[model samples]
Target: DPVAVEALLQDVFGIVVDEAILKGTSASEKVCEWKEPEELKQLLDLELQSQGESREQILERCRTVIHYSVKTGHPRFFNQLFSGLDPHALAGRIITESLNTSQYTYEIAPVFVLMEEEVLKKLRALVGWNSGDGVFCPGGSISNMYAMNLARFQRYPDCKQRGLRALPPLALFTSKECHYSITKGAAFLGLGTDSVRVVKADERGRMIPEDLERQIILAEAEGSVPFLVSATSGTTVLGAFDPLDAIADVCQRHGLWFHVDAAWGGSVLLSRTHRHLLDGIQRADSVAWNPHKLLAAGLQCSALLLRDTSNLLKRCHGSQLFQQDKFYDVALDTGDKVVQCGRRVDCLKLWLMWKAQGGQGLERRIDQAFALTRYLVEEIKKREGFELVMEPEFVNVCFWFVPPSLRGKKESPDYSQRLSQVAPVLKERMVKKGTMMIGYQPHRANFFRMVVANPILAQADIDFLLGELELLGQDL
Candidate 1:
């Protein structure tokens, strides 16, 4: 049994132990084998029995699970915001899992606490802040919530002690296309959903800075206190960057907390070439970023960075559990800064990845992703049946795959109605075929949103994806 366990560890769970396993994932393989809910349930025995199964049975189950799971690392797997894999970061996750420690104080997670501090310092420098504070959370949505709550506490410190009943009606401003988390954050902060002032976006989906000011004035006139303005760097559907400089001027004049939701686009800061897209980010009071999206760090690596180091602890520190008097070095004891007590060692993987790929190396990956997006855009323009939704500022290439039956047809209500039905049909074909994984959604009409963020994807892979789409949709 001991020998069997060791062999399974080396052969089954060990990703790096077998080089052949690592080598197999790099090619343009099928993204996943699809099955319906009922079919999948029958194919895999996922129930918990009254008794555990034998080791052989368990190992067989593991193999089956791997076979069915979507290969996010596959070069052709361009479905979501995050894809691909970094070996160093993967190793960091393995090592962190082996340690199984939580970050609370130096007495428990000493190395991780310092590692997080250093990682935050580097991120702060990239934001052009002299000194600041940050914390790695589960995701960008939670990071946005943290930013909102911190802003609330800074505006009304007594609200934490006395609750929302003590404060005036508060409102926050954000692009209409901004993440749904802003509205969710408002609801979680005891401010009603109506408190979110949805500012209009331009044709390219960027938040109109003048419209943001107009709404702020409009909200004030309605007897609402404006506390925060959340600017989006990369919107969800269109991947457009808002005008941060113009919005920053508005925030300065009004003295409202400026927050940038740079979850998808913040990785551009590593590239000197693309960093100009997020110009005037340093002026923001707080920013939420997720490296897992573009940098391809392991999943669930997100940070909420603050320009002012004092605000995090000053606003959100309600726990007596993180008493400065108890720890030998209170500066290292960073648990008092946020809502969560036992934070996972999320900083380790990111730190290790950064160490392996220095600044320039990471910059190249960012540049490569954008380069792939540009190539795809050019290809779509040249192709007969493909139509561009809008010019993508970021990696989200939104376009329609018009079937041959509908090709060269002039725009009409009848034509538009039929075109809207094509994406779902093609999507079903792709899923059953499993040649590749791409996403489609209703943005005016249903269109494919090919996210090109994986660094491993090349010209051939892009060609494969486009060709596959054509093959699948030609008869539709």
Candidate 2:
């Protein structure tokens, strides 16, 4: 039994154990074998009893879970903005898990703490900030919340001590297509959803700067103080890039804090050719970036960066718990600067991936993703009944798959209604068949929003998707 334990460790505890998963994913060997929630519950035997299972039983359970789960690393898995795997990043994840350390202070997590500092420095430099500060947090939503709070703190420092009761209600502006997190952040900060004015965007989904200025003037006239303008880079649905230069001008004129939510498209900054999509990002007072989206550095790697180095600490720092005089170096301890007391070692994976790929390698990956998107767009145009939602500025390729029955239909309520039903119906068939995975959204009617960021995807996979979709939906 002891020898078995050692053998298991050697066999199941390294990349060799995951070779089957990687190979299956690359080969598109079923993104997920479909199972309903109740069926999965029964099939998985998920309940825990007073007695624990043996190591062999647990290993078998792990295999079962993997068998049923969606292979997100699959080449054809264009379900979200993030997909695929980087081996270096995966190795770092394993190392982090093995270490099982919290990054609260240098005392407990010296390497990770320093790694976080260095990684944030590199990210800030990419944003064109001369000097700045940031913290890696749970996700992009939390990073946006941190930006909101930091903006509020800059406007009225007393809001922290006195709460919202002592201050006037403040307003923020964001595009209508901006992430839901902005509105959530508003409600969370007691500003209420109404305080977040949804500025209109152009037909291309970029925020109309004139409307932004107009709204700011209106907010002031209504006796509400306008404190922040949250611009988005690569919006959730259309992947639109808001006009940062124009928005920055509006913020500067009104003395409002400018924060860019570049959670989905921030990795483009690594590309020399594509970085201009976020022109004038340097003007932002703060930025929320997620390398996990494009760089594929595992999950939950988001950074909230501030142009002012001292403000993050000034706004968020507290507690006498960290005041141990016996510490080797007090300034290196970064626990007081974060909303989380015990942060995971999220920086290591990103750092390792960056080291492996380098800046130019990351640029190539981003360039390749955009190039693939272009190829996808061209294919959609050549195909019958495949209407593009918009010319994608990034990797999001929104397209409608029209059935043969409705091939030459004009744009009308009836045509839109029927066309909208195609994506969902096709999605269902694809899921049940376990051929490939794609996502759909109702941008008027249901349209397939295929995002291609996985480096492994190629022309063959793309052709397979089109053929499978048509084959599944032709009779419908």
Candidate 3:
């Protein structure tokens, strides 16, 4: 039975290597094998049996699973805020899974415990911090939540034990175009969604710092305590960076905690050429950065970095289990430093990837993405029936591909209404045909949000994306 189980592991690994890693990332391979939910259920094995299946059947199921899954690593897979696959990160991830260990204590995860600190220290240095504290979290969303919780704790430490009743209504500020997580974090922190004051962003989606100041004054007038300003570095839709310097000035004058939600755009800090986009980031009290987004360091590799030299994170979330009696160095026990006790060892993959692709290599990769974004923007301008939403500041290129039917219909009253239908029809055709994956949505009217986060993409891939759009939308 032991030999059979060992063989099964090898066979499963073989299937994943061939089907998921190799074929999934190939340019020629389809991003997904299109299947509807009900139909897919019929095709897949759903039930769990009392007795497990033989090695052959298990291997078949593994292949089946990989066969139907979308290849996010595929160069054409340009949906959502994250994509691409780092090979070194994947290797680390495999090893991490093989040696399943919780990232709670040095006793449990000795190597990963230090690895997390090492990665976090380097990341903090990138933020211009001489020394600070940080911890890897689930993702950018929770990382933002951590910032919110910490900011709240910094103001009213008693609120953690006594709850929100003792304090006045708290107001958290973020741009209108900021990620939904800020509002969600507000709610999750017992501040409520209405507590989040959505500051207005300018035409280019950058938060108007003047308006942010005005809102803070208004909140003070209304007897609400303004504690934190969650500025967006890489906005969800527009990929715009808030004026960090100006916002920092506002935070300093008002004595509020400055939190930069650099979930998507933080990786630009690695790029010498593009790092200026996040100017004034050094002034932030805390930053939520996800390496998984643009750095391609695999999923769930996010950190909440605090510039405070004090052990504030541990203070806010520390608990009883961290006993010094039996421990060699209690400082190594990271369990109390986080909201969650059973933390995942999310540092290894990112650390391994960083070691393999040194700071210089990552800089080159990020610069390449910006260049690709510029190329796509120029191509969108040159092509007929394609309309740029606005000049993009980051990797997200928002544009509308006007089909043959909608061309030259500006005089019509329903021109705006008619234009919105193009992307859905084209998207339906694109997915059904398994041609390529591109994200679309209504922001005023429907437009395609083509993002370039994958390192493998080139001018050829960009050309393919644009050409395929023309081919699919010509009839519409």
Candidate 4:
């Protein structure tokens, strides 16, 4: 049985390495072999049964799955906040999958627990958190939620026991351009959706501190207590950074807890040239950052960092799951650090990626992404029929590709409507073609959000992406 297991493992790996890894990542290969869900389900034969399938059948299933899946590692796949694959992380992923350990206690996952601590140390220092604690989250969205709960716990330590009934109508503030998670997280944390006071942002999406103060004053005047200010380091769509310094000043004056959601843009801290974008982040009480996004550590490597030296998380999140009388030093048992009693071994992949790349190597990746971003922006400005959407300051280059049919129809009564239709049609074609992939959404119009989340981007890839967009939309 062990011999058969070994054979099956090796065989499946052969398919993974060939079909999903090597060929899937090649530049000449398509990012997705696009197929409708029904069609793919038929091709995939996804039904699981009580009967055990033969190894040969499983191998073919693996191959089919890989063939149909979108290769995020592909050079031109710029669809979301996370793309590209790190081999070191891949190795860590494989090892951890084999080990199958949870991160609740040091006894079970001693190595990964320490690795998580060390990696968090490095990450916290980057945020200027010399003394506080942090925890790896499922994703950035959840990290932001942790910050909200921690902030509330700090304000009303009895809220955990008493629930929302003991507290006043509490309020938090974030920019209008902030991540959708902030409002949703407020709802998740038992704070009403109205608990979040949507602050104003300038044209570039940086939260205006002046308006933040006004919102606070207005909320206080309306008899609501402002408790925390959730500032953004890298906003979701616009990639705008809130003015942390000014926001910090307002928080200090108001005696509110300051939390910075740097989940996406926090990777800029690695770059000497670009880290200035996150200036004044050192003032935050808590900061949520995701290395998986721009740092490219693989999926779901997010951290919720705090500047408090004490065991804030343990105090706020203690439960019966974390026993007092453990055989070993229970301090190493990080079970109560977050809400989850059983956690995945997420910290290993990030630690492996960090060890492989080193500090400066990661910095170079950040720098390279910004460089490619600037290149894409400059090219889009000059490219015919491509309209730049408000001059992107970060890796997200938002633009619209106006078709030939609507080139000179700007003053037309239906110009806005025509512009909106372009990206949807273009996107449909892009998916059907499947050579490359990008995402589109409605802002001022249906514009493309070309994120340089893929760390290994090149000038030619940018050229190809733009060229493909032009070629696809030309006939329209």
* Candidate 1 residue pairs in backbone clash: none
Error of 4 at 192 (Å): 1.1
lDDT of 4 at 9: 88
Cα lDDT tens digits for candidate 1, 189-293: 789899999999999999998999999999999999999999999887889999999999999999999999999988888888889999999999998999989
True-structure lDDT of candidate 3: 0.90
lDDT of 2 by residue, 180-221 (tens): 999988898788999999999999989999999999999999
Q: Count the backbone clashes (under 3 Å) in each candidate.
A: 0, 1, 0, 0
Estimate every model's Cα lDDT from 0 to 1.
0.86, 0.87, 0.90, 0.88
Kindly list the per-residue Cα lDDT of model 4 for residues 1-476, writing each as its tens digit. 99988988899999999998898779988899989889887888778889999878888889988888899999988788888988898898888889999988889999988988888888888877667788898988999899999999998999999999899999999988888889889999999899999998998978999999999999999999999999988877878888899899999999999999999999889888888889899999999999888877777789898888788899899884675576888898888889988888888888888888888899898888888888998899888899888888888888889888989889999898889988888888887888888888776788888999776678999999889988998888
Error of 1 at 226 (Å): 0.6
In terms of lDDT, the poorest run of 10 residues in model 3 is 318-327
lDDT (0-100) at residue 359 of candidate 2?
88
TM-score of each: 0.95, 0.96, 0.98, 0.98
- Best first by TM-score, ranked: 3, 4, 2, 1
The better candidate by lDDT, 2 or 4, is: 4
- Write out the backbone clash pairs for model 2: 420-446
* Preferred candidate (lDDT higher): 1 or 4: 4
Worst 10 residues of 4 by lDDT: 319-328
lDDT value, residue 165 of candidate 1: 91
